[PDB]
Design a protein around this ligand. Structure first.
Ligand SMILES: CCCCCCCC/C=C/CCCCCCCC(=O)OC[C@H](CO)OC(=O)CCCCCCCCCCCCCCC
Ligand SMILES: CCCCCCCC/C=C/CCCCCCCC(=O)OC[C@H](CO)OC(=O)CCCCCCCCCCCCCCC
Ligand SMILES: CCCCCCCC/C=C/CCCCCCCC(=O)OC[C@H](CO)OC(=O)CCCCCCCCCCCCCCC
Ligand SMILES: CC(C)CCC[C@@H](C)[C@H]1CC[C@H]2[C@@H]3CC=C4C[C@@H](OC(=O)CCC(=O)O)CC[C@]4(C)[C@H]3CC[C@]12C
Ligand SMILES: CC(C)CCC[C@@H](C)[C@H]1CC[C@H]2[C@@H]3CC=C4C[C@@H](OC(=O)CCC(=O)O)CC[C@]4(C)[C@H]3CC[C@]12C
Ligand SMILES: [Ca+2]
Ligand SMILES: [Zn+2]
Lengths: 484, 663, 129, 194, 52, 117, 44
């Protein structure tokens, strides 16, 4: 039936829908008609944001209504006066309210002082005296807890209810223990080459060392925690975080190198020098994947900068400027493909990694793309002598030099300066919300350690009406304070 | 566990009768105040003041009730500084009534405060009583010296107050015979003061800007071209415009009507130049440049003829000069062709054809430069940066000629060029000529101000060169530090030219060697590493001392990081900030520069291109009648813009309701 | 960008004129060079400032750091001439890379900010065209 | 160290025969570093001038953010250095097997650039300024897969270091200077009063 | 405008979308980029593709 | 409660009425409020605003000198330029950079060279 | 100390008056207008 009306008059149909939603998003109407005004503002705000995407022409009007809904629920929370009211609001179920705000992207609600004060008490738990300690005393506490992480993780395993058993239960020490567990995994990787026997460099079927079994235990531990997080939350929620994505690729690369290593030891065990092996021998392929996965292991430490209040806001700012880099990739990718077509047409009829670079880099599509790629830096990686034809072609050598010179001006002088111009413009807009964005990211990271589902570090994990009436009393107080 | 709160500095409290009198005064009940004052006279206080210091007269003034103020004055109440308080509120009636602890410094007079408030009516009312203002001194006089030593704060305040009073637009309009010239001179003098008194810079700059704005806004009231020509041609020919140019009045010069008169003067002999297709203008500019020799020769042969008068128009002058300079540059470009010069092994060469043709141009440039400098004077020559460049270029040309003469007389025979010494006169002459060519070809950038698209950009770029020197000082200091360190480390391993291959020593050889073996070479090597032209292997040593090589490499890396990651980005940021500030006033600066360029061709003193060059009471009466009209229109305008308040109208409607009730 | 390229072309022409005036007395022949290659597109660069066209080509490629530093040397080993030529090259490098490029950066920054406020309207006009 | 060297050694000897840890060499290196540090103290005299004072103060206040940037760059550099050293450590060659008895990248023919972690860090540091040649990723045994992986990792490191981080730093430094410029006068006057 | 019929009448008036073409000729960018005109143009453009 | 007490104690009128030495009280209160902003991260903005208000009150109180004798009396008070040293110790940049204080410092620094400017 | 307390007394008095000026004059004038208008007419 609605489709029939849209055929007769679509401008009138769209205007009526926006009129209704603007009436529903009235702060006065929600307070007077809804039983749970805080939850109503959360759901409506997520509802109005989706409508902006579909209604492209009404984009501006809808995102103004969503912003109005978000600011209303934040002002309602600011009227809380003591911790008893704060705990009632943030624990209600229809920290369910606190988790619901994170799911609905309520950044203003989270950054409120009442919400921030509540988070600090839960995060530190029974160790509230940590905040009274001086800076010199704080570091000695973190280092001591981190160094003795195997003991504390073991104590919880045998005596969970003991004094040392309950240490992990507080979120702050759990974050440190998990952090120190990962730092030892990176230390094992660094020591892998140092304890490598030199006689195994010429061995084609080397067996697994004791250090290799240690890394296998960690990898299963990291993997095991990954299904648990995915199973308890879901695919879309788990895939959204960048740290989770980097764990997917590096875990598959670690399984591939060890699967290839076992097969190689059982098939190819010959004793021959390294210089005589095949290019695509399984042992050489195994080492290529291992090196690649080591880069992705060290790059996971970016999320640990969010906790710091000095490097935290800066890291979040750099994350939001990566979206502007993707748009420039699309335009530059076509320019690189255009000059590759012409350059390989001129020279193939008639590489750069040698000590004496030659014209042979332009004799293939892959070689031409690599040569043009290294011109972007402006550090003189490739010489001009490459453009000269080996036998003669005086005229064709000059034309090829002009083509390369045009590429340099277009990319190094025009495209690069344009990229800097937008980063100057975008950063100024981002700098405005630097504090609100960082606090939302830090609270999201803290909330993951509140759940007791995952408590042990990765090597150890593998081893086996009454409240609704109280909520209404607080709600009427908050509503009536807000009106006044 | 508690902080006691108690008044530390206590003041005597008023009596109950005095407080009641104060409340009656504030309530505006004349009968109650009359009865209280009669009782006070019977008992034998109106002189009482609050702990805040607000007396009954001050409250009466503050409430703007003329009746209570008139009655209180009739009873011989203390006056004190009531006139200043009445003036500060800007109420005329209280001021005329008054004429018929404190909130002000003791050096302030009623005329000073009236000038500060910039109220035309009150200033006019005070001037009729023949008030005076002290003239500030320019100073090593004993009076100024003693005043400065005795109390510097009072002296500085008083000077600032006097200059604030003098720079009032209303006072200047009301009491000055020549408001425009007064504004010009006051702006210049106030600008000079901010440099001497560093602490009070901002106020003096603000006053100077106010004077400039007043002078600019007075000219906007002209309604006809006759008035504009009277204003601009008044002599104390465009004398007023030249005076404004002398005092750096950019806004006065860049007014649209003043620019229109100048454009009319500039395009003499070209009606409807603006109404032409760009092609027609380009063709017109090309043909006049081609015919430049004929026009110049015609003027010499017969000035009276039409072709003689054609060069007199400023635009034709500009085109002919540009064409002559372009021809000179093209001839310079052609002197390096090997076709002209046949032999290269002659110790003393007589001049070739191209140099013979070039020499008259150099002589003309020198003669014109010295004539201009002699006519203008040293200061005006030093003021413009371009004149310095001309002086350097002409000095280099003269040195080239002088060196060429000595070589020809001293040397007769011919020798292979590889056998000559390093300090041969011919080589020095050639190097000087090349530097002169570089300097000459860079003079063309000064012609960019005549274009509407390339002019403002050139002005903006030229305004950004002051900070670059500031950064260059710091960079030079850092470079000297690191060069000292590296040369101290590496000077023990200096080799000879014989030991090196090809017999080449330095970083200007295919294999770089001895990069840090001397201070001069260290400076050169650290300069060239900014552009990436120094290879990394120059930090190695033959003896293979690993510790020394590592220390040198770490020094080099620290220098590279500091120079390329910190200072370059800092310079980028600083020049970005400066450009945004400059861009907001680019149009006015470009118009000022173009106006300065235009007036250089209005004079008839220098007409020939360089190669050809070597071969009053009634006027005061009309000015005063125009100035009177401009001031009258100016006053009626500024009142309407800012001196218009809705709140003042509100009480007037209340008074109208009071009058209707009385009726 | 073209407005800036005008000024850059003027500066380049001035410095090319000066360098070619200085360095044209020592032109060699192609057969006198190894591999019989003459110019800056050879394995060992030579005759960089011998002709005006070659001087323009050499000064263009020095913007990207593709011109070596030994091209300012001469076979006769006249130290004064080589020092003057190196000083000219260094002055050109400083002017072109430390000044003009950064001014271009600043002007592009300013122009983009004014343009950005209307990007949506212009894009939609182009799209409906 | 100079006194110790004077007391201990009492004879003349060719300088090329001295060992690596001779006291005289250490004394000379420390003296050179001292000269560098001494010459840099003249910046503190800029606050007495009204022209170079505020600029010096503003440059001083801008050094706090650069360190925060350098921490993140250090993390990235450590990651890529670990990866490259893990890939390339099997093909380490001795100094005798190389021409002129070179090992490392301070030679005309750069070699063994990724054989140890320290040398890998030095090699990755010098790639920012373009002083590392592209043939250092080649392998004598001529294995195509290893060389391809090494070249890809080197290119990714170069892209991340020189195309993203440098421009981000430029924008950040632009924004910070504009805020600092507002309060330059008060800070300079405070410094000059001190 | 409050209804689609009025918008069609205004945009299609001829002294085919003649008024839109006249606006394009005169570089009326703010007029053309109005949300209602863009909605109508998108309806015309994505014909045969409901809910694209 | 702590924030309310500290906000009450930082009122310029209360300091003027009830303090024996308003300038020293403003200095100490500003320093203490600046130090509290780091410990109490939840109320950083409020404490920073209070510290700024205290600094501005002290500067504006200094701005009301009408003679050099009063300026010398204020600057030389000890509980030699003792007050200036106390201001420097507490990072009172706006107080130090006042034009009259700078003029006095300049006449002290340029001793022996009259009319140097 | 006696001289210092004398100078502090003068500075505080000047500071109080200056800050009162920005707060008080407009409000006082507006209040005196309408209030005076609405009571004297009633008395008449
Ligand atoms: C995605 C689209 C973005 C915008 C694209 C257009 C950008 C505007 C510019 C276009 C580039 C035009 C071609 C310029 C280079 C020509 C090739 C070349 O010279 O190769 C050397 C070749 C081969 O040696 O030599 C020549 O072509 C001989 C003549 C050289 C004369 C000197 C250079 C002239 C001025 C060029 C200025 C370029 C900008 C520099 C800014 C600092
Ligand atoms: C003008 C006033 C400036 C005041 C000071 C400003 C800040 C200066 C601080 C700079 C940090 C310098 C840290 C040491 C680097 C230089 C020593 C060195 O490596 O020499 C080579 C030497 C010898 O080959 O290498 C080493 O000794 C260790 C090499 C590995 C460690 C590299 C550390 C990198 C630090 C950050 C670099 C950032 C590069 C740009 C990123 C976009
Ligand atoms: C459109 C026109 C814009 C003009 C803008 C001008 C801005 C200011 C620049 C002036 C140019 C300076 C020319 C002289 C120095 C360059 C020539 C030279 O060194 O010759 C080498 C020659 C040959 O090796 O050697 C010498 O002349 C002696 C050694 C000099 C070493 C110290 C150099 C001090 C100046 C360094 C400036 C660095 C600037 C970038 C900093 C990141
Ligand atoms: C080959 C060598 C000799 C270099 C040759 C350069 C000339 C062909 C160009 C370079 C810059 C040009 C100048 C750039 C700008 C202007 C302003 C322009 O201003 C006008 O009067 C016209 C525009 C307007 O009405 O605003 C007049 C020409 C002129 C001097 C140009 C004259 C021709 C010049 C000197
Ligand atoms: C840069 C390299 C080559 C070192 C060699 C130069 C030095 C001799 C210069 C560089 C910086 C100079 C200083 C920069 C600024 C000042 C402040 C200046 O104080 C004033 O007279 C300021 C007057 C004003 O406020 O304008 C006294 C000299 C002094 C210490 C200068 C002393 C001489 C210095 C150390
Ligand atoms: Ca001249
Ligand atoms: Zn005097």
């Amino acid at each position: 039936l609605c489709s029939a009306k849209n055929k007769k008059d679509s401008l009138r149909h769209s205007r009526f829908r926006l009129d209704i939603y603007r009436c529903l998003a009235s702060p006065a109407l929600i307070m007077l008609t809804e039983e749970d005004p805080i939850l109503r503002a959360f759901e409506l705000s997520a509802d109005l944001k989706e409508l902006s995407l579909v209604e492209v022409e009404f984009r501006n009007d809808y995102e103004e209504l969503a912003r109005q809904c978000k600011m209303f629920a934040k002002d309602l929370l600011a009227q809380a006066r003591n911790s008893r009211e704060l705990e009632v609001i943030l624990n209600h179920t229809s920290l369910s309210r606190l988790k619901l705000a994170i799911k609905y992207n309520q950044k203003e609600f989270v950054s409120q002082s009442n919400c921030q004060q509540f988070l600090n008490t839960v995060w530190f738990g029974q160790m509230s005296g940590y905040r009274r300690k001086p800076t010199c005393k704080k570091i000695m506490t973190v280092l001591t807890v981190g160094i003795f992480w195997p003991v504390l993780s073991l104590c919880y395993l045998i005596a969970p209810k003991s004094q040392f058993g309950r240490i992990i239960h507080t979120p702050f020490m759990k974050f440190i223990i998990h952090g120190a567990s990962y730092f030892t995994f990176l230390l094992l990787l660094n020591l892998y080459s140092l304890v490598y026997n030199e006689d195994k460099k010429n061995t084609m079927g080397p067996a697994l060392e004791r250090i290799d079994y240690l890394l296998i235990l960690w990898i299963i531990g990291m993997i095991w925690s990954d299904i648990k997080r995915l199973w308890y939350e879901g695919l879309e929620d788990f895939l959204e975080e960048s740290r989770n994505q980097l764990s997917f690729v590096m875990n598959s690369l670690y399984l591939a190198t060890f699967a290839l290593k076992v097969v190689a030891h059982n098939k190819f065990h010959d004793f021959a020098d390294r210089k005589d092996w095949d290019a695509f021998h399984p042992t050489l392929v195994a080492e290529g994947l291992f090196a690649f996965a080591n880069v992705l292991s060290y790059l996971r430490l970016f999320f640990m900068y969010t906790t710091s209040s000095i490097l935290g806001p800066l890291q979040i700012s750099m994350g939001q400027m990566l979206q502007d880099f993707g748009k420039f990739l699309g335009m530059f990718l076509l320019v690189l493909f255009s000059f590759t077509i012409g350059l390989t047409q001129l020279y193939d009829k008639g590489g750069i990694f040698c000590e004496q670079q030659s014209n042979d880099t332009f004799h293939s599509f892959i070689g031409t793309c690599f040569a043009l790629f290294w011109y972007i830096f402006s550090l003189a990686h490739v010489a001009i002598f490459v453009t000269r034809f080996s036998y003669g072609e005086e005229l064709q050598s000059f034309v090829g030099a002009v083509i390369v010179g045009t590429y340099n001006v277009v990319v190094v002088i025009v495209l690069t300066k344009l990229l800097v111009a937008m980063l100057h413009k975008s950063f100024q807009l981002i700098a405005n919300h630097e504090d609100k964005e960082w606090k939302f990211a830090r609270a999201k990271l803290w909330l993951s350690y509140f759940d007791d589902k995952c408590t042990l570090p990765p090597p150890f994990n593998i081893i086996p009406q009454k409240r609704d009436e109280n909520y209404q009393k607080v709600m009427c107080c908050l509503v009536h304070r807000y009106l006044t | 566990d508690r902080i006691p709160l108690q008044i530390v500095r206590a003041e005597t409290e008023l009596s109950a009768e005095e407080k009641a009198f104060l409340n009656a005064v504030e309530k505006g009940d004349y009968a109650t105040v009359k009865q209280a004052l009669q009782e006070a006279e019977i008992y034998y206080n109106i002189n009482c003041m609050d702990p805040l210091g607000r007396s009954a007269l001050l409250i009466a003034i503050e409430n703007e009730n003329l009746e209570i103020m008139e009655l209180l004055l009739n009873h011989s109440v203390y006056v004190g500084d009531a006139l200043l308080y009445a003036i500060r509120k800007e109420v005329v009636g209280a001021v005329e009534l008054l004429l018929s602890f404190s909130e002000f410094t003791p050096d302030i007079t009623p005329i000073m405060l009236a000038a500060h408030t910039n109220n035309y009516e009150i200033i006019k009312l005070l001037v009729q009583k023949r008030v005076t203002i002290p003239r500030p001194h320019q100073c090593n006089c004993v009076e100024c010296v003693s005043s400065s030593e005795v109390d510097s704060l009072r002296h500085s305040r008083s000077r600032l107050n006097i200059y604030k009073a003098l720079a009032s637009p209303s006072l200047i309009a009301l009491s000055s015979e020549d408001p425009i010239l007064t504004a010009f001179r006051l702006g210049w003098e106030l600008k000079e003061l901010s440099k001497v008194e560093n602490e009070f810079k901002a106020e003096y700059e603000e006053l100077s800007q106010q004077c400039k704005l007043f002078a600019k806004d007075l000219l906007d009231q002209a309604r006809s071209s006759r008035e504009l020509e009277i204003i601009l041609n008044h002599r104390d020919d465009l004398a007023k415009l030249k005076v404004a140019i002398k005092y750096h009045q950019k806004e006065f010069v860049a007014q649209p009507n003043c620019q229109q008169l100048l454009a009319t003067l500039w395009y003499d002999g070209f009606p409807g130049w603006r109404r032409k297709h760009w092609v027609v203008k380009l063709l017109t500019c090309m043909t006049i440049g081609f015919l430049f020799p004929m026009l110049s020769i015609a003027y010499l042969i017969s000035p009276r003829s039409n072709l003689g008068l054609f060069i007199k128009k400023p635009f034709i002058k500009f085109i002919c000069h540009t064409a002559s300079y372009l021809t000179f540059l093209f001839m310079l470009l052609l002197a390096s062709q090997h076709i002209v010069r046949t032999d290269l092994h002659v110790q003393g060469p007589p001049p070739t054809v191209v140099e013979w043709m070039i020499l008259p141009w150099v002589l003309g440039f020198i003669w014109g430069e010295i004539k201009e400098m002699w006519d203008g004077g040293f200061t005006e020559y030093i003021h413009d940066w371009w004149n310095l460049m001309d002086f350097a270029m002409n000095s280099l040309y003269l040195a080239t000629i002088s060196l060429k003469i000595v070589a020809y007389v001293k040397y007769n025979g011919s020798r292979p060029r590889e056998e000559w010494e390093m300090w041969h006169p011919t080589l020095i002459a050639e190097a000087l000529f090349a530097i002169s060519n570089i300097l000459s070809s860079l003079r063309l950038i000064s012609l960019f101000t005549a274009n509407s698209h390339l002019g403002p950009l050139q002005i903006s770029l030229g305004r950004m060169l002051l900070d670059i020197l500031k950064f260059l000082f710091i960079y030079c200091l850092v470079l000297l530090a690191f060069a000292n360190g590296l040369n101290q480390l590496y000077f023990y391993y200096e080799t000879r030219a014989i030991d090196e291959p090809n017999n080449c020593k330095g970083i200007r050889c295919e294999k770089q060697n001895n990069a840090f073996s001397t201070l001069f070479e260290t400076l050169q090597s650290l300069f060239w590493s900014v552009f990436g032209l120094l290879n990394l292997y120059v930090t190695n040593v033959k003896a293979r001392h690993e510790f020394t090589e590592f220390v040198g490499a770490t020094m080099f890396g620290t220098y590279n990081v500091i120079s390329l990651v910190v200072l370059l980005n800092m310079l980028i940021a600083m020049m970005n900030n400066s450009y945004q500030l400059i861009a907001d006033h680019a149009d006015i600066e470009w118009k000022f520069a173009r106006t300065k360029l235009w007036m250089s061709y209005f004079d008839e003193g220098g007409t020939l291109p360089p190669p050809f060059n070597i071969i009053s009471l009634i006027q005061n009466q009309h000015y005063q009648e125009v100035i009177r009209n401009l001031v009258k229109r100016y006053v009626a305008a500024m009142i309407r813009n800012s001196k218009t308040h809705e709140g003042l109208t509100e009480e007037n409607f209340k008074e109208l309701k009071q009058d209707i009730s009385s009726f």
